[PDB]
Every structure is written in C-alpha cells, then in structure tokens.
Amino acid sequence: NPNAQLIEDPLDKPIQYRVCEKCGKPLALTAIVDHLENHCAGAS
Ligand SMILES: [Zn+2]
C-alpha cells in the first residue's frame, strides 16, 4: 500500500519565459498575468 509512497501527478508542462521589455525580468507564462497587472511603467 502507498503509505508514504506518492504517485506524483505528471506535470509535463514546460513553462515558457520571456523577459518583460520594460522591466527586464524573465516572465513565465504562469506569472505573465500577475506581473503585467502589478508591474509599474518605468520600473527599473
Ligand atoms: Zn514588467
């Protein structure tokens, strides 16, 4: 029986990244939304 055994749910999702043109930080597709929302124009 799996008492301490964990059958890990496969996360076969490579998350893509791009740097934010104005901030310069690498944004993953998972974080693009919250970053884009909270980011400031002129963030340096
Ligand atoms: Zn940004």
Reference 20, options 10, 12, 43; nearest CA is 43
Which approach determined this entry? NMR
Pick from 38, 43, 2: nearest CA to 21? 43
Domain that holds residue 41: 16-44
What's phi and psi for 36, nearest 5 deg?
-60, -40
The answer to whether the beta carbons of residues 39 and 20 sit under 8 Å apart is: yes
What distance in Å separates the CA atoms of residue 30 and residue 8, rounded to the nearest whole number? 21
Distance CA 31, CA 44 (A): 19
Strand partners, 27: 18
Is 24 annotated to bind a ligand? Reply is: no
Residues 19 and 44: their CA atoms lie apart, in Å, by 13
Task: Give Cα separations from 30 to 1, 9, 12, 13, 19 (angstroms).
Answer: 35, 18, 14, 11, 13
- Contact in structure between 25 and 36 (CB atoms under 8 Å): no
CATH label of the domain that carries residue 42: 3.30.160.60
40 is in an annotated binding site: yes
Ligand 1 centre to CA of 13 (Å) is: 23
